Amino acid sequence: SNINQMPREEGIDSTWRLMEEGYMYILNRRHSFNSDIFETRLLGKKAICMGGKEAAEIFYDTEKFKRKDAAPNRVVQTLFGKNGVQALDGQTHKHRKEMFMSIMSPDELEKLTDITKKQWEIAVDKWEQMDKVILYEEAKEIMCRTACQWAGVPVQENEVKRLTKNLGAMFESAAAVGLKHWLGRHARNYEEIWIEELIDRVRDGKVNPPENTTLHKFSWYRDLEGNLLDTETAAVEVINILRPIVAIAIFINFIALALHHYPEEKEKLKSGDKKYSQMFVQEVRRFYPFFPFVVALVKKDFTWKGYKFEEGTLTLLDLYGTNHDPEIWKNPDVFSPDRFAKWGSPFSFIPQGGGDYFMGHRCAGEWVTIEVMKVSLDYLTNRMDYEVPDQDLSFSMASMPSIPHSKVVIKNVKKRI
Ligand code: HEM
Ligand SMILES: CCCCCCCCCCCCCC(=O)O
């Protein structure tokens, strides 16, 4: 059939509009163009942006889209690391992804939840002897201690503080400009070298992590040819566990926000029926902004909706806008856990990617995230009391990630006993 012209945003480069609008950039234009797909110019080149469940399923078609060389270098050097799983395609990707999925078994997730609970207890005891407590910063430290213990990474106290700062900077810098962006580049450089040394100690026999742990599994994994991963690559992969675990602190912020803003939803949790906590956690992941979009390159020319996708074109999948799509969800722009009662598809609810864990790039740590969020919600509701003082809890849709301006201050913390 005839090739049609995709809706097109004019201007020599539109990256500035993405920087100004953030999470809302793609959905605003899906609305104004009356199309789930449009073309623009971002980072000096043509770009295609698309959202909704059909677009998501097409984006996850690995005959049509590849990840090699898709992410901008500025994102590789902050968020991802070079030559990690995010960069791979085909059987090489499948085999690397199996390494990540191998640490996600029932017994290992139980180990994670036990650690997470203990580290919450430790933090709460500390906060009870404090006055004001900055939840985002304290939660990053909870999650850094949890990550290192679960991963088998030995850390001294000074190393905990430094890692918490540097892992934070890696994700807080990825969509930043200027001075702030470079903090994350330097943070990544420092921890890559530190983790590389540690992996060399594992391989030399001088450190002996338990067999079940990330550090053991990633240090000893062999590729499709039977060879150990390069030390640099294995370090990037370990950081691809430690960093996103720290990042759960962003979702902890939003759990606390939701408990403060929605007392009727909090009261439904006081029952002990786990269905309510499950719905609440899912709705936090659906409603609040976090990972805006993912990127791929067109692998081979193809047609969809009458439009030509040309090989090599950078393509953005709108995660935020799909999670807020009024063609998928009833009243998408309100927080309503009841929408999940006995719950859509793997392409419609995509805060941590869509599709299949093994056949695509969907987040390896989605179950970790959900389980950590459940522990955190249980702590904040059932194991402590605190006050939320008057403060600026607003969160900007132009900042990625989006953090409430006050960083969520709590006070008068008391552990229930
Ligand atoms: C804290 C909140 C998190 C969010 C919002 C999040 C979101 C995402 C998204 C959107 C992707 C990319 C999907 C794609 O490329 O198609 C991804 C990939 C990934 N995530 Fe997460 N994630 C989080 C936590 C975690 C955790 C806790 C872990 C590890 C325990 C983790 C490990 C990974 C890995 C290894 C990948 C790359 C998978 C691949 O390329 O095949 N993430 N995540
Ligand atoms: C490829 C688009 C980059 C988007 C900008 C990053 C803002 C969100 C931070 C996401 C962190 C998710 C977990 C992680 O990978 O550490």
Author numbering: 2 to 344, 346 to 419
Q: How do the authors describe this structure?
A:
However, CYP152K6 purified from an E. coli expression system was crystallized and its structure was determined to 1.3 Å with tetradecanoic acid bound. No lipids were present in conditions used for crystallogenesis, and thus CYP152K6 must form a complex by incorporating the fatty acid from E. coli cells. The protein crystallized with a single monomer in the asymmetric unit and showed good electron density for the entire protein molecule. An arginine residue, Arg244 in CYP152K6, is phylogenetically conserved in the CYP152 family of P450 peroxygenases, and makes strong hydrogen-bonding interactions with the carboxylate group of tetradecanoic acid. There are also extensive interactions made by several hydrophobic residues lining the active-site pocket that further stabilize the alkyl chain of tetradecanoic acid. The bound ligand is positioned in the active site in a binding mode that is above the plane of the heme, and with the Cα and Cβ carbons of tetradecanoic acid in close proximity of the heme iron (at distances of 4.8 Å and 5.5 Å, respectively). A water molecule at a distance of ~2.1 Å directly above the heme iron acts as the 6th (distal) ligand, with a cysteine thiolate providing the 5th (proximal) ligand. Interestingly, the distal water molecule is also within hydrogen-bonding distance (~3.0 Å) of one of the oxygen atoms from the carboxylate group of tetradecanoic acid. In contrast, the CYP152K6 tetradecanoic acid alkyl chain has a non-linear configuration in the active site. The alkyl chain bends by ~90° around the C8 atom of tetradecanoic acid to produce a well-defined structural “kink” in the lipid chain.
